[PDB]
Design an enzyme around this catalytic site. Sequence first.
Site, mmCIF file in Angstrom:
data_model
loop_
_atom_site.group_PDB
_atom_site.id
_atom_site.type_symbol
_atom_site.label_atom_id
_atom_site.label_comp_id
_atom_site.label_asym_id
_atom_site.label_seq_id
_atom_site.Cartn_x
_atom_site.Cartn_y
_atom_site.Cartn_z
ATOM 1 N N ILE A 42 0.842 -1.191 0.000
ATOM 2 C CA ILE A 42 0.000 0.000 0.000
ATOM 3 C C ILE A 42 0.876 1.240 0.000
ATOM 4 O O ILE A 42 1.739 1.399 0.862
ATOM 5 C CB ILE A 42 -0.950 0.033 1.205
ATOM 6 N N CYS A 43 0.625 2.127 -0.941
ATOM 7 C CA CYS A 43 1.250 3.439 -0.946
ATOM 8 C C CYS A 43 0.412 4.385 -0.093
ATOM 9 O O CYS A 43 -0.577 4.959 -0.557
ATOM 10 C CB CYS A 43 1.382 3.947 -2.371
ATOM 11 N N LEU A 44 0.820 4.559 1.156
ATOM 12 C CA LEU A 44 0.153 5.448 2.096
ATOM 13 C C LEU A 44 1.212 6.173 2.907
ATOM 14 O O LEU A 44 2.100 5.527 3.479
ATOM 15 C CB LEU A 44 -0.760 4.654 3.032
#
Lengths: 149, 149, 77, 79
Positions: free
Chosen positions: A85-87
């Site tokens: 996840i790109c967070l």
Amino acid sequence: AMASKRILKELKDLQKDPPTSCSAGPVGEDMFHWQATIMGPADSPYAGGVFLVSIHFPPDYPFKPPKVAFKTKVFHPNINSNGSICLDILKEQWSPALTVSKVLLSICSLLTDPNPDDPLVPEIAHMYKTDRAKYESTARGWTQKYAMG
Amino acid sequence: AMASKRILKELKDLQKDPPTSCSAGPVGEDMFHWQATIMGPADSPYAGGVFLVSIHFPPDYPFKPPKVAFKTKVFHPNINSNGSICLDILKEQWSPALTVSKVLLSICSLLTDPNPDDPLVPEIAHMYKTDRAKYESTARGWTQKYAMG
Amino acid sequence: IIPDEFRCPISLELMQDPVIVSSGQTYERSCIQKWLDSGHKTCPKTQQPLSHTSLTPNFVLKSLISQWCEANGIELP
Amino acid sequence: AMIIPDEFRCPISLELMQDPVIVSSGQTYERSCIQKWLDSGHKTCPKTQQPLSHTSLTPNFVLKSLISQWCEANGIELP
């Protein structure tokens, strides 16, 4: 050690006031390992989908961020096939004071409003910008395959 | 006006937990003037003594120290025959967080353990360091002459 | 149930040495120190930058904790 | 309700605090009161009489919150 009590206390509080569309708990008895289940937001092409997420705690947690990975497949610009996840919470805007709950809420926020300009899957990012209707449609179909059943 | 509020509320505090060997309160309804009574401490050569003390509050109390003097004659190397008390809290080391209660307590610590090193009557300090028995005796006589009764 | 003010945003336990950062937020001394040592200069709870990296003890909250513990028969933190 | 906890009162005003702030010594005072003392050229803590290792007045938020919960739960307003 310090990390162990903190996770234990974080789990207790999470099960007191659980996050809005979400459920999480230890994987059996390794409370350093957590499974969370997220329901697809309704504003989303993910509605009616159940998404499973994996949670492992670093050694210096809560000072290092936790390891958060999808187990269910999703057509999304910021979630790849390996479930990464790109967070920002998960990389650089982490704080010793944030929680698994906060991360789950932020993931639901991403699912509603993807962030195409920081892509992890550039083709999906490109589709979101240039053919949104195809993105929305392809997401309904991936949700139907891997989440609803 | 702030000074008056702070005095009335300091007065209520003294009434709840009054200082140890001491009684103090306003002169009538004039609220910036207090008389106070100190019982001579047991170890001291003022034991069995009753000493009276005037307290006059500045207009900028508590930011300016109060005026406090003996009205009862004493044989002390830091008190003079006009009642002037030489104690640092009343002059240089005053603080907006000190109270009449804390001052009275210091006057008690003074009668018990006087400071020869800074006199206001060098005669008595000379006696306290040259012939202590001359001092204790002269003190007990002044106590019975002026303070017992 | 521990009042939430008496707990550390980082440790989530009752605080033993509550100290305050320039943001005005209170933390357990060892945790907040560790994070500053890591090199970060932000208040973890509000995520804003800190003007200065100095830890001032919060003695009033220390007192209010010690009292609540004595009230509720809990070991002092 | 009628006995204000001593911890909510300003060491200088002896009054329940509206804007609690904390100086480098770790003591807490009402903002206006500690300001008047510093503006008079004293750079020392009124309560510990130790000299103040800086002058920034940082807010004591956790204390302000506790004062509000105590006020609401007993019926006191905070002028």
